[PDB]
Structure formats: structure tokens, C-alpha cells
Design a binder for this molecule. Structure first.
Ligand SMILES: NC(=O)c1ncn([C@@H]2O[C@H](COP(=O)(O)O)[C@@H](O)[C@H]2O)c1N
Length: 246
């Protein structure tokens, strides 16, 4: 593989919080949670292993089953590394609270489906501290913890591009928590549709899968979120970082 000056693929280990625990689901389905203990210990583990980013989700807030605001605040404050924070960020107050944690950026999901004028305003005011999470089954967007129906993926990308959105985080729900491998086709198709950076999520199962996503960096894929493969020890984060470096 020929040398290049392009950046390497960024890795964002996930810490998804439900009922006070770091959890992994299958297709994000409520009730399929596997718990891996405290979110703080999980986050600090990834930081010790050399993580540059943490992808931190309050899943109770996404589902609407209470929240974990104090814990995700504490985790964010403990990180020296960059933190991408999401879950429940759907109006001015929840956005203000999220930003006050000192996270590096937030992801908006449901609000891009239910409150597009508000998302447009937030993008215009906050720039690259905002990314939109586009979570699909096929090309159909889903909200509210993936329990609600949104529209077509590409319609949304076209609108959000025009509104000046900086970055998209794209999950294939059918791959998430499955260790089936990532949907590379989805990533290539999204990169064909937008010139903004794209962060992949869902299905990574192996170092070879990360290498495959890394090949798409020159198409526009900036990073990869990894959950179950790290928690289930398919590989270490040290190994994953070396795999995408070189
Ligand atoms: N069911 C799930 O696993 C799930 N549901 C939502 N999410 C994440 O929650 C966040 C969106 O929350 P909201 O829709 O409240 O903005 C995004 O990061 C999105 O990927 C999940 N990981």
C-alpha cells in the first residue's frame, strides 16, 4: 500500500450507558444488553490503551427510559482525550447541558428527524461541535433509540449538506452488535453522496474489518466507532491502532 499524506483512520471506542452500566446490544434492541461494568472503568481502559476519542452514548436518554446524565458527565470530565457525546440531545436545554460537560462534539439523532429546523439552527451556531447521527435499517432512518421511523437517508444527507452540517456518524443498525462485519457498501454510497467527513459505526468484528474501513479513508471515511469487538476481546485497542496505522 503506497505511502500517502492522508490522515489515518480515527478509532472511537464506544461506551454506551444503560442503567448505570457500559452495555452492548444486538441491533440496538432493548433487552439484548450485555453489561461490561462501570462506564468510567471502560472509558479509562480505552484511554490507557491509547484511544484518541471516546464515543459516549446515554442510551437511556435515547430510549426515553430516564437518563445517566451524572455518569456521562463524570466520564466526560475524567477524559484527557476527545469525547463525542450523544443521547437525548433534542432541544436547547439538553444541548446546553451536553456542551457544558466539555465534550469535543455532540451527535444529534432524533432531532434531525423530528426537529430539522432546530438542527439547522444548531449547526449554524455551533459548527463542528455538532455532528448528525444517521442510523439506518437499509436506507430508512430511525430515531428514539431506533424505535421510531424517519425518512430516506439520502434525502436527509442532501438537506443537512445544504444546512452546512460538518460531519455524519452513520450506523447500520442491522450490523450493530452482531460481529458480522461492517457494511462497506453503505459507507461507499454515503461518501459518494456527501463531501463531509463520515464516521462509520456497527459490525466491526476483526482487524481485517478495520483495515477494510481504512481503505475508504481516501473516499471520505474519517473514523470508525467500535463496540462489541473490543468488549468481547476480538482484538485489543493497541492492536487496532497498529492495524490502521500501518
Ligand atoms: N438502540 C441503540 O443502541 C441506540 N439508539 C440510539 N443510539 C445512539 O443514540 C444517539 C442518538 O440519541 P438521540 O436520538 O436522543 O439524539 C446516537 O449516538 C445513536 O447512535 C443507539 N446507540
Amino acid at each position: 500500500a503506497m505511502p500517502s499524506k492522508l490522515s489515518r483512520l480515527e478509532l472511537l471506542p464506544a461506551v454506551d450507558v444503560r442503567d448505570g452500566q457500559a452495555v452492548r446490544l444486538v441491533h440496538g434492541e432493548s433487552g439484548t444488553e450485555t453489561s461490561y461494568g462501570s462506564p468510567l472503568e471502560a472509558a479509562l481502559s480505552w484511554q490507557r490503551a491509547g484511544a484518541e476519542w471516546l464515543h459516549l452514548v446515554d442510551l437511556d436518554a435515547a430510549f426515553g427510559t430516564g437518563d445517566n446524565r451524572e455518569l456521562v458527565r463524570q466520564v466526560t470530565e475524567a477524559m484527557d482525550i476527545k469525547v463525542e457525546l450523544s443521547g437525548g440531545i433534542r432541544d436547547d436545554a439538553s444541548l446546553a447541558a451536553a456542551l457544558a460537560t466539555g465534550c469535543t462534539r455532540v451527535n444529534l439523532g432524533t432531532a434531525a428527524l423530528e426537529s430539522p429546523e432546530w438542527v439547522a439552527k444548531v449547526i449554524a451556531e455551533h459548527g463542528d461541535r455538532i455532528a448528525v447521527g444517521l442510523d439506518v435499517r437499509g436506507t430508512t432512518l430511525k430515531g428514539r433509540g431506533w424505535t421510531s421511523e424517519g425518512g430516506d437517508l439520502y434525502e436527509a444527507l442532501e438537506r443537512l449538506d445544504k444546512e452546512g452540517c460538518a460531519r455524519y456518524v452513520v450506523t447500520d443498525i442491522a450490523k450493530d452488535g452482531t460481529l458480522q462485519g461492517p457494511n462497506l457498501e453503505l459507507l461507499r454510497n454515503v461518501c459518494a453522496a456527501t463531501d463531509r467527513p463520515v464516521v462509520a459505526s456497527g459490525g466491526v468484528s476483526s482487524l481485517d474489518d478495520l483495515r477494510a474501513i481504512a481503505e475508504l479513508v481516501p473516499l471520505g471515511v474519517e473514523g470508525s466507532i467500535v463496540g462489541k469487538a473490543l468488549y468481547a476481546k476480538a482484538f485489543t485497542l493497541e492492536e487496532a491502532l497498529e492495524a490502521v496505522a500501518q
